[PDB]
Design an enzyme around this catalytic site. Structure first.
Site, PDB file in Angstrom:
ATOM      1  N   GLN A 195       0.742  -1.409   0.045  1.00 50.32           N
ATOM      2  CA  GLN A 195      -0.419   0.101   0.143  1.00 50.32           C
ATOM      3  C   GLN A 195       0.584   1.349   0.065  1.00 50.32           C
ATOM      4  OE1 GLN A 195      -0.364  -2.869   1.696  1.00 50.32           O
ATOM      5  NE2 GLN A 195      -0.015  -2.018   3.884  1.00 50.32           N
ATOM      6  N   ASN A 218      10.232  -6.734   1.873  1.00 52.44           N
ATOM      7  CA  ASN A 218       9.697  -8.080   1.424  1.00 52.44           C
ATOM      8  C   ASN A 218       8.989  -7.995   0.648  1.00 52.44           C
ATOM      9  OD1 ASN A 218       7.187  -7.240   2.209  1.00 52.44           O
ATOM     10  ND2 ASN A 218       6.708  -8.242   4.467  1.00 52.44           N
ATOM     11  N   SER A 241      15.660 -12.465   1.362  1.00 55.28           N
ATOM     12  CA  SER A 241      17.085 -12.354   1.630  1.00 55.28           C
ATOM     13  C   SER A 241      17.544 -13.750   2.215  1.00 55.28           C
ATOM     14  CB  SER A 241      16.343 -12.066   3.882  1.00 55.28           C
ATOM     15  OG  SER A 241      17.330 -10.572   4.319  1.00 55.28           O
ATOM     16  N   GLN A 263      22.354 -13.677   9.550  1.00 47.37           N
ATOM     17  CA  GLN A 263      21.157 -12.842   8.074  1.00 47.37           C
ATOM     18  C   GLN A 263      20.327 -13.881   8.751  1.00 47.37           C
ATOM     19  OE1 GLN A 263      18.897 -13.401   5.200  1.00 47.37           O
ATOM     20  NE2 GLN A 263      20.817 -12.353   4.448  1.00 47.37           N
ATOM     21  N   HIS A 266      17.377 -11.901  10.556  1.00 44.97           N
ATOM     22  CA  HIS A 266      16.133 -10.637   9.721  1.00 44.97           C
ATOM     23  C   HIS A 266      14.532 -10.836   9.876  1.00 44.97           C
ATOM     24  CE1 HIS A 266      18.568  -7.659   7.903  1.00 44.97           C
ATOM     25  NE2 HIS A 266      19.345  -8.452   7.650  1.00 44.97           N
ATOM     26  N   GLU A 331      23.185 -13.298  -3.918  1.00 48.56           N
ATOM     27  CA  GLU A 331      22.690 -12.023  -4.058  1.00 48.56           C
ATOM     28  C   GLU A 331      24.144 -11.473  -3.286  1.00 48.56           C
ATOM     29  OE1 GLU A 331      18.819 -10.245  -3.630  1.00 48.56           O
ATOM     30  OE2 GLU A 331      18.168  -9.754  -5.233  1.00 48.56           O
ATOM     31  N   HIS A 332      24.171 -12.165  -2.459  1.00 50.98           N
ATOM     32  CA  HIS A 332      25.301 -12.139  -0.870  1.00 50.98           C
ATOM     33  C   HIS A 332      26.336 -13.573  -0.405  1.00 50.98           C
ATOM     34  CE1 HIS A 332      22.628  -9.150  -0.536  1.00 50.98           C
ATOM     35  NE2 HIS A 332      23.195  -8.320  -0.140  1.00 50.98           N
ATOM     36  N   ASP A 365      25.942  -4.404   5.604  1.00 52.34           N
ATOM     37  CA  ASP A 365      24.854  -4.070   6.281  1.00 52.34           C
ATOM     38  C   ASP A 365      25.009  -2.862   6.237  1.00 52.34           C
ATOM     39  OD1 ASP A 365      23.551  -5.889   5.030  1.00 52.34           O
ATOM     40  OD2 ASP A 365      22.430  -5.913   6.937  1.00 52.34           O
ATOM     41  N   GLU A 419      15.759   5.146 -46.794  1.00 53.30           N
ATOM     42  CA  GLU A 419      14.566   3.910 -46.297  1.00 53.30           C
ATOM     43  C   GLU A 419      13.559   4.414 -46.295  1.00 53.30           C
ATOM     44  OE1 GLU A 419      16.472   4.046 -42.301  1.00 53.30           O
ATOM     45  OE2 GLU A 419      15.653   1.797 -42.707  1.00 53.30           O
ATOM     46  N   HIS A 424      11.829  13.080 -42.959  1.00 47.53           N
ATOM     47  CA  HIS A 424      13.123  12.815 -42.208  1.00 47.53           C
ATOM     48  C   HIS A 424      14.003  13.398 -42.926  1.00 47.53           C
ATOM     49  CE1 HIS A 424      11.567  10.157 -39.174  1.00 47.53           C
ATOM     50  NE2 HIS A 424      13.064  10.235 -38.509  1.00 47.53           N
TER      51      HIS A 424
HETATM   52  N1  LIG Z   1      20.749  -4.571   2.940  1.00 51.01           N
HETATM   53  C1  LIG Z   1      19.621  -4.507   2.816  1.00 51.01           C
HETATM   54  O1  LIG Z   1      19.258  -5.385   1.878  1.00 51.01           O
HETATM   55  C2  LIG Z   1      17.992  -4.846   2.876  1.00 51.01           C
HETATM   56  C3  LIG Z   1      17.454  -5.973   3.243  1.00 51.01           C
HETATM   57  N2  LIG Z   1      16.294  -6.356   4.268  1.00 51.01           N
HETATM   58  C4  LIG Z   1      15.227  -7.685   3.625  1.00 51.01           C
HETATM   59  O2  LIG Z   1      13.631  -7.058   3.293  1.00 51.01           O
HETATM   60  C5  LIG Z   1      12.751  -7.551   4.196  1.00 51.01           C
HETATM   61  C6  LIG Z   1      12.463  -6.686   5.345  1.00 51.01           C
HETATM   62  O3  LIG Z   1      10.863  -7.487   5.731  1.00 51.01           O
HETATM   63  P1  LIG Z   1      10.267  -6.842   7.474  1.00 51.01           P
HETATM   64  O4  LIG Z   1      11.287  -7.064   8.491  1.00 51.01           O
HETATM   65  O5  LIG Z   1       9.301  -7.804   7.704  1.00 51.01           O
HETATM   66  O6  LIG Z   1       8.981  -5.023   6.689  1.00 51.01           O
HETATM   67  P2  LIG Z   1       9.262  -4.205   5.354  1.00 51.01           P
HETATM   68  O7  LIG Z   1       8.945  -2.683   5.570  1.00 51.01           O
HETATM   69  O8  LIG Z   1       9.900  -4.963   4.700  1.00 51.01           O
HETATM   70  O9  LIG Z   1       7.221  -5.355   5.363  1.00 51.01           O
HETATM   71  C7  LIG Z   1       6.288  -5.085   6.473  1.00 51.01           C
HETATM   72  C8  LIG Z   1       5.035  -5.070   6.258  1.00 51.01           C
HETATM   73  O10 LIG Z   1       4.960  -5.985   4.945  1.00 51.01           O
HETATM   74  C9  LIG Z   1       3.316  -5.837   4.481  1.00 51.01           C
HETATM   75  N3  LIG Z   1       2.837  -7.385   5.150  1.00 51.01           N
HETATM   76  C10 LIG Z   1       2.957  -8.050   6.268  1.00 51.01           C
HETATM   77  N4  LIG Z   1       2.001  -9.294   6.197  1.00 51.01           N
HETATM   78  C11 LIG Z   1       1.129  -9.092   4.955  1.00 51.01           C
HETATM   79  C12 LIG Z   1      -0.025  -9.181   4.311  1.00 51.01           C
HETATM   80  N5  LIG Z   1      -0.412 -10.833   5.208  1.00 51.01           N
HETATM   81  N6  LIG Z   1      -0.006  -8.944   3.119  1.00 51.01           N
HETATM   82  C13 LIG Z   1       0.049  -7.739   3.248  1.00 51.01           C
HETATM   83  N7  LIG Z   1       0.864  -7.008   3.457  1.00 51.01           N
HETATM   84  C14 LIG Z   1       1.335  -7.370   4.799  1.00 51.01           C
HETATM   85  C15 LIG Z   1       2.738  -5.055   5.293  1.00 51.01           C
HETATM   86  O11 LIG Z   1       2.104  -3.450   5.372  1.00 51.01           O
HETATM   87  C16 LIG Z   1       3.833  -4.237   6.538  1.00 51.01           C
HETATM   88  O12 LIG Z   1       4.144  -3.276   6.606  1.00 51.01           O
HETATM   89  C17 LIG Z   1      13.143  -8.665   5.132  1.00 51.01           C
HETATM   90  O13 LIG Z   1      13.609  -9.607   4.200  1.00 51.01           O
HETATM   91  C18 LIG Z   1      14.882  -7.681   4.825  1.00 51.01           C
HETATM   92  O14 LIG Z   1      15.616  -9.119   5.430  1.00 51.01           O
HETATM   93  C19 LIG Z   1      15.688  -4.952   5.322  1.00 51.01           C
HETATM   94  C20 LIG Z   1      16.702  -4.020   5.400  1.00 51.01           C
HETATM   95  C21 LIG Z   1      17.942  -3.930   3.864  1.00 51.01           C
HETATM   96 ZN   LIG Z   2      21.825  -8.082   7.686  1.00 54.41          ZN
HETATM   97 ZN   LIG Z   3      22.131  -6.420  -0.719  1.00 54.73          ZN
END
Ligand SMILES: NC(=O)C1=CN([C@@H]2O[C@H](COP(=O)(O)OP(=O)(O)OC[C@H]3O[C@@H](n4cnc5c(N)ncnc54)[C@H](O)[C@@H]3O)[C@@H](O)[C@H]2O)C=CC1
Ligand SMILES: [Zn+2]
Ligand SMILES: [Zn+2]
Ligand SMILES: [Zn+2]
Lengths: 438, 428
Positions: A195, A218, A241, A263, A266, A331-332, A365, A419, A424
């Site tokens: 959203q 996510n 992740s 990892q 997370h 990816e990592h 990170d 052409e 042109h």
């Molecule tokens: N350096 C990098 O690339 C980093 C990567 N990440 C990764 O990104 C992910 C973060 O995920 P979160 O901690 O959960 O925060 P998030 O902000 O990514 O997700 C939470 C949102 O997901 C929605 N949600 C939850 N359940 C839902 C459902 N059933 N249906 C519809 N929407 C729903 C909600 O709107 C909620 O606000 C993780 O997998 C993390 O490992 C986190 C920060 C930095």
């Molecule tokens: Zn991390």
């Molecule tokens: Zn990354």
């Protein structure tokens, strides 16, 4: 019972399918998330602010009546700065300094160049009007992600940098808000998921439509980002992740376990995989995991992710280790070996690489956000479309002289006539000049 | 009989509504195209070559027994270079030298830098394995698009550059095929539309899966590119053929008419708009359009384009002219005014800009090649894959881990903190 990490062997004949299942299985279900994400976007497109407040209540567990309760002023950000410790403020400022100094060295602007015949060429470089920062906040808080995206946007000169971060159960993380203040974020909305991506991409009555959306998220954020592709700019969709650690058995097994823990802590869907040809080392990593896990403050999240997707994989030799790594395609990649530049040639499918025994994801990170390069003065000399470039728009410029139009039009006319594109050809021929003509 | 271009006035209080409609008006709904593109993509993954041949027969009007009849050998490209005129060949070869020289100077490879504390940072740069290049079929196909896309991919080291170009009713564009020979295209398939994009993105029996798809195409190509994003890299979605001409009224009206005609002649959905504060100049362009249109070979396509999306728009002054231009956000802007550098700061939402009275958009479609100066990230770079490398020394991890540990502990990400802390050294 000591936690027993999942063990795998590339010698066992079912390794191919056993590995394919570990990387493929999905509990959230696919097309299921896709359908819910499509439904959320359509709702925010039609019902606007009302939909986001209702989705925020449903998914984030919030109790807000209007959009205004979900809007944080700039003053709330400055107050967060005062509510964090001194060690945490300076750590935020030290990270900000390195990020900001690097992006200042890379900022390129408009330029013009005059050719011999008088023709002027160049680029006009202008900052995007509005940039949207998604900061994940569902299961943890990520302040370094704020600095990594908001600072290069401000350095580019983006007039309005808007940040969305979900506040589950109304809980507000002051370190993340303090990072936003240091990074120069203008407005903070306490929304998340698909959203929030929808609100920034299309716009609501209270959320401005931005030119680019950036940030990790996510499955809902990632899925929402690929849908709005075309409607609004996006950085790169980030896959699930994951960490793949490849070790030769000469790294402290507690370090490797903790690197996998990092990892794993997370989210419960996190994938932590270790590959090594050293069998006795893998046993020690299992002993290290069992010893260290119970004391971990997020031991429940780590245990869940390891059970679902963790693996300790035994391979025959370095070549098989690299084969398994290319199948996983991480990816990592953490290259915890003694000769990591000697393993890299046979590792063709890997994004960011941490090399050696002293580097892990926690450093990537918190200290390496743009394109996964560490911001230093020396790294600045090497240009990137990521960072400041990504928050800028570039318009190519051609200003022909009368003579320059004449030489270019002769070549253009030949190709256009060949052409049957006669409009042109004639628009170019109009500018061809012959001094002998009176 | 005489054609009368649509006329709008920003002095009219209702102007914004008409402009909104001019920019939003579509003939085939994007959802109608969307379903067709999605179903074609699904059909190409499901049935492979068989779907590619069936769609080629339906949409290109080309009888083909097998996929093999749609594969063009590289020797046919060498033949094409034989069948074009001397002047066309030198135009292609001269442009190719400038394009190739430019990208050779811009190419960057893998690098490493060693910080004072021993930490090594860098990038491992690898050329993409395969690139796919879309080129429209028939005559309305810029060979410069082949040169500008295939040459940087070869300079980057891409091993297999694949061109897809539909042959409507079996028609070949020899100049385009010759440009592909000069550009180093390795293989050619006479397929097009969403099914060509889908075949490159996912692979069929005979069409290899490529790592990136580039090049210009109509709504079906652009929509297919949006949908294959993720499965395959893409350049830009590419917008509709569009020109915005802004004129102070002191350019020859026949030139402005021809400049509008040149964009309108690409395809029927092209959009050509002229904005000026000089009402009498707009009447002169309007007369020039009516007189010049029947003289044009592609007059039928031009007329359909101008009727659907063309307009001449009067404004009050340079400021309003620039305001309207910023709202149109033109992919191509022709600033046909006395001091073009004075207008551009107020028109920041435009794409490529052609400045002055002597610079037509047709010069952009027929780029004769860069020079030694355009050097100093959209050419060779976008056919390379980059892997970031961080190799901390013990001391480097100690400096970085000190900052990481504080923030991670602050957010209770204790595994992150302890992982970094294992590498922090005690200070003297
Ligand atoms: N350096 C990098 O690339 C980093 C990567 N990440 C990764 O990104 C992910 C973060 O995920 P979160 O901690 O959960 O925060 P998030 O902000 O990514 O997700 C939470 C949102 O997901 C929605 N949600 C939850 N359940 C839902 C459902 N059933 N249906 C519809 N929407 C729903 C909600 O709107 C909620 O606000 C993780 O997998 C993390 O490992 C986190 C920060 C930095
Ligand atoms: Zn991390
Ligand atoms: Zn990354
Ligand atoms: Zn263009």
């Amino acid at each position: 019972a000591p936690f027993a990490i999942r063990r795998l062997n590339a010698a066992d004949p079912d390794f191919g399918r056993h590995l394919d299942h570990l990387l493929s299985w999905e509990s959230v279900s696919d097309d299921s998330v896709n359908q819910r994400v499509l439904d959320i976007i359509a709702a925010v497109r039609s019902r606007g602010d009302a939909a986001v407040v209702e989705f925020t209540q449903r998914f984030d567990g919030l109790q807000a009546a209007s959009m205004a309760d979900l809007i944080l002023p700039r003053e709330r950000l400055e107050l967060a700065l005062t509510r964090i410790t001194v060690a945490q403020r300076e750590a935020l400022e030290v990270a900000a300094e390195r990020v900001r100094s690097y992006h200042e060295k890379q900022k390129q602007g408009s330029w013009r160049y005059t050719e011999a015949d008088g023709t002027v060429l160049g680029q006009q470089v202008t900052p995007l009007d509005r940039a949207g920062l998604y900061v994940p906040g569902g299961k943890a808080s990520y302040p370094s992600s704020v600095l990594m995206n908001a600072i290069p946007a401000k350095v580019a000169g983006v007039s309005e940098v808007v940040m969305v971060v979900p506040t589950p159960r109304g809980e507000i993380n002051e370190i993340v808000l303090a990072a936003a203040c240091i990074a120069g974020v203008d407005r903070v909305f306490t929304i998340g998921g698909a959203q929030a991506v929808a609100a920034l991409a299309y716009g609501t009555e209270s959320v401005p439509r931005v030119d680019k959306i950036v940030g990790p998220g996510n499955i809902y954020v990632a899925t929402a980002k690929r849908h709005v592709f075309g409607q609004v700019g996006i950085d790169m969709i980030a896959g699930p992740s994951e960490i793949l650690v490849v070790c030769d058995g000469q790294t402290d097994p507690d370090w490797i376990a903790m690197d996998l823990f990092s990892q794993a802590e997370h989210d419960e869907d996190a994938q932590s995989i270790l590959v090594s040809p050293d069998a006795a080392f893998l046993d020690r990593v299992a002993d290290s995991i069992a010893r260290l896990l119970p004391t971990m403050e997020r031991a429940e999240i780590i245990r869940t992710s390891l059970e679902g997707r963790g693996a300790l994989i035994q391979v025959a030799d370095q070549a098989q280790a690299c084969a398994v790594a290319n199948r996983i395609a991480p990816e990592h990649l953490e290259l915890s070996v003694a000769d990591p530049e000697s393993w890299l040639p046979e590792i063709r499918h890997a994004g960011a690489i941490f090399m050696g025994r002293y580097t892990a994801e926690a450093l990537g990170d918190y200290c390496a956000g743009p394109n996964h390069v560490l911001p230093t003065s020396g790294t600045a000399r090497f240009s990137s479309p990521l960072g400041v470039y990504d928050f800028q728009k570039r318009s190519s410029i051609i200003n022909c002289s009368a003579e320059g139009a004449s030489v270019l039009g002769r070549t253009a006319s030949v190709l256009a006539r060949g052409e049957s594109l006669t409009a042109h050809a004639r628009s170019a021929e109009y500018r061809i000049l012959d001094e002998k003509e009176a």
